[PDB]
Amino acid sequence: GVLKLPIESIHRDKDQPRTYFDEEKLKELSESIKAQGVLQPILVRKDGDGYRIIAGERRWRASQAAGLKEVPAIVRDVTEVQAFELALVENLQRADLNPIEEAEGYKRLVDEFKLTQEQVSVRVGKERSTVANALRLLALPTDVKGMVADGSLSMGHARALLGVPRLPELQNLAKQVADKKLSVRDTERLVQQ
Amino acid sequence: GVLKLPIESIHRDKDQPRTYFDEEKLKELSESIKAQGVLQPILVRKDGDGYRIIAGERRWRASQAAGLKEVPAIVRDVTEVQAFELALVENLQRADLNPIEEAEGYKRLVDEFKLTQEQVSVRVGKERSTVANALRLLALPTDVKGMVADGSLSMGHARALLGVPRLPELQNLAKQVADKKLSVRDTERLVQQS
Ligand SMILES: Nc1ccn([C@@H]2O[C@H](COP(=O)(O)OP(=O)(O)O)[C@@H](O)[C@H]2O)c(=O)n1
Ligand SMILES: Nc1ccn([C@@H]2O[C@H](COP(=O)(O)OP(=O)(O)O)[C@@H](O)[C@H]2O)c(=O)n1
Ligand SMILES: [Mg+2]
Ligand SMILES: [Mg+2]
Missing domain, CATH: 1.10.10.2830 (Arc Repressor Mutant, subunit A)
Structure with missing residues (x-):
């Protein structure tokens, strides 16, 4: 099942689908690993002098950054077309x-x-x-939280709307912002009152 | 390590952080499982006469819909507080x-x-x-798909810009739309004129 593999025994897949690695998000992942360890084993393939990552490069990098010496892993015996499918599925089938x-x-x-x-x-x-x-x-009213929850209002929109003094005036302004679909800048100009 | 647990021995956590379950996304997950199996074991806690889910309710629901009789799982001996932390970490520590x-x-x-x-x-x-x-x-130009890549251009913004016949004008609208943060509907009107 789940081995603990030395990080030094694992190397990245240079052809993996992810090319951009946000450093700020890697930092958060590393902090979570310090607190909880790696919750989900990475998927690797035997390769060269060790293993090649199928899915889980961030976990591996973040573990390295946190100073862990091993990472939980599942060893998959797959073709490299299937390995590439696994990497896409692991990232694209989430909510x-x-x-x-x-x-x-x-x-x-x-x-x-x-x-x-x-x-x-x-x-x-x-x-x-x-x-x-x-x-x-x-602290927002239900209707407004519903619009944040379903995406009608963004984080940035919600930011500005917290400045509205009156809650009733806050909902109507929020409903217009979502309904007309205003920019964040337009919302802030509206909130000034 | 990883157990194959019967799906019928696993039940959901009624207090888990997720309350909305998109049906279309569950359908997609189920089809991926039909093709690949479950790639990442779910996390469960011993509970009652079976197991409670810590993280992985979607995988569990989709596996049932796919017709699987078992699901890969990792059994964690944790407090209730730590289990809830794990559920939040599993979902919020992703890119x-x-x-x-x-x-x-x-x-x-x-x-x-x-x-x-x-x-x-x-x-x-x-x-x-x-x-x-x-x-x-x-089919978009490099500079434009870079703006798509970093989120300067949304999916709908890209969709409209595909309708521009000439690449030089597509790029100029792309910059204008992204720099001014125009709406999708506004972007569409620009494209029709062009
Ligand atoms: N402490 C943590 C934090 C996140 N994770 C998982 O690590 C995965 C991160 O996915 P990702 O696509 O952003 O990065 P990769 O490690 O797959 O390259 C998620 O499945 C998270 O649930 C974990 O196993 N342990
Ligand atoms: N065929 C598949 C498709 C996705 N997955 C993983 O299952 C997780 C889905 O995450 P999620 O938060 O949307 O749903 P839950 O199963 O955690 O409730 C991701 O870590 C995906 O990489 C899998 O293990 N096997
Ligand atoms: Mg991944
Ligand atoms: Mg989850």
């Missing part, structure tokens, strides 16, 4: 939590499990600013 | 391929590995329209 689901998750850790916002940040590997801003979404 | 990376992946399966576009849809579990539309992005 993220929406921003309200994320924020309510942080809220449960604080309210129910009695973590501080600091502890949530450390335990999940997310920046303090990300945890704090998600929680602030939950 | 998607950008639209161009996705499109070039389909193109490699076709050009290098000699799959048909039909087979790409089957083997990766994506709708035929999704594969076709992604591939159509690669």
Whole structure:
């Protein structure tokens, strides 16, 4: 099943589908690995003097960055066409939590499990600013949170709308922003009142 | 390590962070599982007379819909608080391929590995329209698909810009749309004039 493989025994697939590696997101992944370890084993292929990654290059890099010496892995015996299919499937067959689901998750850790916002940040590997801003979404009214949750309003839109003094005025402005589909800049000019 | 657990011995976590389950995405996941199996074991906790899911409810639902009788799983002995942390980490510590990376992946399966576009849809579990539309992005000029890659141009913005007949004017609208952050509808009106 799941081996613990030395990181030095594993090398990247130079032809893998991901070419861009966001350093800020790699940093968060590394922080989460320090807190929780790697939760899902990477997929590798025997190759050369060791193994070649099929899927899981970020996990491998982040583990290296955190100073871990091994990474959980599943060894797959596959053709390289199938290995490439696996790399696409692993990344493309996912559904993220929406921003309200994320924020309510942080809220449960604080309210129910009695973590501080600091502890949530450390335990999940997310920046303090990300945890704090998600929680602030939950001060919005239901209708407005619904528009954030379904994507009618973006993070940036929600940012600006938190400045509106009156909640009723806040909903109507939010509904226009989503309904007419205004830019974030137009929203902020609107919020100035 | 990884167990094959019977699906009927696994039940969901009613307090898990995800509350919305897109049916189309579950369908796609199920088709990918029919083609490839479950690639990443789900995380479960001993609970009642079976197991509770920590992370992986979609894989579990899709496996049932695919007709599997078992699912790969890792049994974790954790507190309730740690299990909820793991559920959040599993979903929030990810980075998607950008639209161009996705499109070039389909193109490699076709050009290098000699799959048909039909087979790409089957083997990766994506709708035929999704594969076709992604591939159509690669007709855009470098500078434009770079803006698609980094999110300067949305999917709808790219769709409209494919209607521009001349590449020099396509690039100039692309910069104008991305720099001014015009709406999709506005971008469409520009394209028709051109
Ligand atoms: N501490 C962590 C954080 C994320 N993950 C998983 O690692 C994967 C990250 O996916 P990704 O496509 O961004 O990066 P790769 O490692 O696949 O290259 C997700 O499946 C996350 O659930 C983990 O196994 N352990
Ligand atoms: N055939 C497949 C397709 C996706 N997956 C993985 O299953 C996970 C799906 O993530 P998700 O958050 O959308 O759904 P859950 O199964 O975690 O509830 C990703 O880590 C995908 O890489 C898999 O293991 N086998
Ligand atoms: Mg991946
Ligand atoms: Mg998940």
